[PDB]
Amino acid sequence: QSALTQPPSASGSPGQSVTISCTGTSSDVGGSDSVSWYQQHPGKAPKLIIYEVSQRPSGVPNRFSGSKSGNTASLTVSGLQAEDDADYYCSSYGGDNNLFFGGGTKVTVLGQPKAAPSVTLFPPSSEELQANKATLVCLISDFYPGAVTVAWKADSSPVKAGVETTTPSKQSNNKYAASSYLSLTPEQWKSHRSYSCQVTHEGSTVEKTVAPTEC
Amino acid sequence: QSALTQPPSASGSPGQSVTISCTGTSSDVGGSDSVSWYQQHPGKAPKLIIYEVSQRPSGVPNRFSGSKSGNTASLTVSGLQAEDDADYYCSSYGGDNNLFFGGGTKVTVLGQPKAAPSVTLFPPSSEELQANKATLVCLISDFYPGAVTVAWKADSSPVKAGVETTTPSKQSNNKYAASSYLSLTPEQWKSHRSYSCQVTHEGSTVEKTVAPTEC
Numbered sequence: 001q002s003a004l005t006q007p008p009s010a011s012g013s014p015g016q017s018v019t020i021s022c023t024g025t026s027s028d029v030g031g032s033d034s035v036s037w038y039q040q041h042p043g044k045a046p047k048l049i050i051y052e053v054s055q056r057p058s059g060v061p062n063r064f065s066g067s068k069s070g071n072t073a074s075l076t077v078s079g080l081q082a083e084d085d086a087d088y089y090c091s092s093y094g095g096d097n098n099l100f101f102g103g104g105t106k107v108t109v110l111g112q113p114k115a116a117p118s119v120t121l122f123p124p125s126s127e128e129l130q131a132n133k134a135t136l137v138c139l140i141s142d143f144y145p146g147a148v149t150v151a152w153k154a155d156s157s158p159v160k161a162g163v164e165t166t167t168p169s170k171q172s173n174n175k176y177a178a179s180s181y182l183s184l185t186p187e188q189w190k191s192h193r194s195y196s197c198q199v200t201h202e203g204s205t206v207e208k209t210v211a212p213t214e215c
Numbered sequence: 216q217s218a219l220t221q222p223p224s225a226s227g228s229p230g231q232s233v234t235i236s237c238t239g240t241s242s243d244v245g246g247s248d249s250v251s252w253y254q255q256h257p258g259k260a261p262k263l264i265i266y267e268v269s270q271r272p273s274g275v276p277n278r279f280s281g282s283k284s285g286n287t288a289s290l291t292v293s294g295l296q297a298e299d300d301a302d303y304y305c306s307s308y309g310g311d312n313n314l315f316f317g318g319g320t321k322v323t324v325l326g327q328p329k330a331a332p333s334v335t336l337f338p339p340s341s342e343e344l345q346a347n348k349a350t351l352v353c354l355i356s357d358f359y360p361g362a363v364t365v366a367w368k369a370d371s372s373p374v375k376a377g378v379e380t381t382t383p384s385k386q387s388n389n390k391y392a393a394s395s396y397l398s399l400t401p402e403q404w405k406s407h408r409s410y411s412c413q414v415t416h417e418g419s420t421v422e423k424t425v426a427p428t429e430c
């Protein structure tokens with residue numbers, strides 16, 4: 001899904017430092033010194049802030065520093081300011097002159113206390129089952145920062161199709177909410193023994209499970 | 216000063232063609248064949264669609280064609296589809312290891328087909344009832360445009376407290392999704408005959424009802 005592997009999210013308080021990694025393979029990150037980093041504020045055009053692992057373009061403050069160790073490049077942002085809040089991407093040229101990209105890391109300069117998400121997993125409703133639909137819904141609410149990743153598990157294996165997750169939105173309590181729904185057929189829901197929703201936030205994971213109970 | 220000049224906006228209806236420009240100088244755009252184009256749906260990672268002025272990466276349909284003349288690069292999107300509604304950025308390499316990005320062009324696919332919402336109401340799960348929670352979720356999906364008003368009913372009376380509704384987010388099917396959830400105590404859920412979710416989209420209203428059952 002993402003050639004280079006970046007953490008989905010990172011965070012720190014104003015004035016602190018935060019380090020985000022960009023892990024590849026021997027033929028890209030560790031094989032050359034062409035790792036770049038890009039910063040994109042929400043709704044803005046991206047900006048190159050690091051090239052050739054460590055070089056800072058003109059106008060990029062020294063608070064941003066890049067390095068590499070093996071197959072993993074790292075960007076460090078010291079003296080975090082609210083302006084540094086943005087999405088950070090890495091890229092690296094490969095062996096056959098192909099450019100590879102990381103998935104991005106959402107960096108949040110905490111503007112309020114951190115809050116873990118409340119998760120509720122709902123099994124199929126009777127009405128939708130009689131309409132040949134067995135959609136599960138994983139409700140996620142009351143979390144901050146608003147970065148979250150969701151993973152569904154049929155029995156114990158990961159599902160890689162039919163998952164949808166809404167963009168997190170601020171609610172009345174100034175915390176974020178979102179929902180992930182898995183569009184299962186009534187057969188899929190009955191054939192397997194249980195489905196699970198896995199939610200990851202600020203590095204920690206929570207998992208709820210549901211199973212057919214003949215109702 | 217580092218800024219390629221793109222048109223702020225472009226629009227067109229399905230099946231139409233659209234061309235957007237990326238004007239630089241003789242040192243960046245007109246000084247090499249390193250012009251790239253990136254597509255980005257809001258709230259999502261971008262995708263490189265053109266590199267070296269005209270090359271499409273694998274997976275990019277030939278509906279997207281790039282060109283260059285003087286210091287002005289142009290991207291053309293023929294046969295506009297709903298999934299082409301997004302932001303588009305150009306970039307070009309400049310001397311001094313500089314990578315210049317344009318301001319970005321929001322392409323709007325006009326007159327996309329209206330679609331009524333699929334409404335699925337979920338009663339409290341067996342787990343959250345043990346945990347003394349009785350939250351209901353009204354999953355609303357597959358509707359366009361992304362405007363909906365939600366109303367909740369207890370039996371026949373309106374519900375005025377404990378209602379939250381996420382902001383509709385566009386999903387992979389190019390239609391919107393959202394979840395309205397009602398926070399009830401188990402006593403509220405078991406003391407009423409039914410709760411209803413009323414979703415209104417484009418003057419038309421759908422209603423779903425659930426009631427306490429053995430489940």
Ligand SMILES: CC[C@]1(c2ccccc2)CCN(c2cc(C)n(C)c(=O)c2)C1
Nearest residue numbers: 038046089101102103253260261262263
């Ligand atoms: C070089 C500019 C990039 C940018 C950033 C923000 C908006 C638009 C473009 C940086 C990340 N970037 C990607 C990233 C990913 C994951 N992919 C798959 C790409 O094809 C391209 C291109």
